[PDB]
Amino acid sequence: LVPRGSNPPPPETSNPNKPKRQTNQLQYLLRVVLKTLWKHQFAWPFQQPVDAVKLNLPDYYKIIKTPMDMGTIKKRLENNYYWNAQECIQDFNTMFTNCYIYNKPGDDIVLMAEALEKLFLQKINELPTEE
Numbered sequence: 001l002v003p004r005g006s007n008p009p010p011p012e013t014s015n016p017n018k019p020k021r022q023t024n025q026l027q028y029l030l031r032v033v034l035k036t037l038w039k040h041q042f043a044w045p046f047q048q049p050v051d052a053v054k055l056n057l058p059d060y061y062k063i064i065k066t067p068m069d070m071g072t073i074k075k076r077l078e079n080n081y082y083w084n085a086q087e088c089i090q091d092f093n094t095m096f097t098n099c100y101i102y103n104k105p106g107d108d109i110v111l112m113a114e115a116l117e118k119l120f121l122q123k124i125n126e127l128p129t130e131e
């Protein structure tokens, strides 16, 4: 009748046990990298977790075991979840890679992801100096 499957909870975005810092690179990742991607025409499918129930994608979380999205990344930055800039960059990379696993090369959503990823890589090439 209907596929049987719930969404997982979204990724964790805060953790009181983790120490917190602000750094040049983390500030850039929020104010330049995330900001630039978030405002893009094609950001919207990537601004929140994939809702497999609403989108009728019952196999999505059968294969995507490390989901990630820009809404999560934004909250993690805002909550000082990341200590090292590379932890945030890795989350963006996971987001893109997940899209390229679940969706066929050349599909609409993949072309959208590629346009965002190009802009991401350009901004990462201009990452500022560390402390």
Ligand SMILES: COc1cc2c(cc1-c1c(C)noc1C)ncc1nc(C)n([C@H](C)c3ccccc3)c12
Residues within 6 Å of the ligand: 044, 045, 046, 050, 051, 055, 057, 098, 099, 102, 103, 108, 109
């Ligand atoms: C086809 O892939 C999607 C379509 C989405 C989506 C999320 C995905 C998505 C992403 C991102 N990574 O894997 C999947 C699946 N999130 C919300 C959303 N709302 C609509 C109307 N869509 C449709 C199905 C859509 C299809 C192709 C390109 C853009 C949106 C979507």
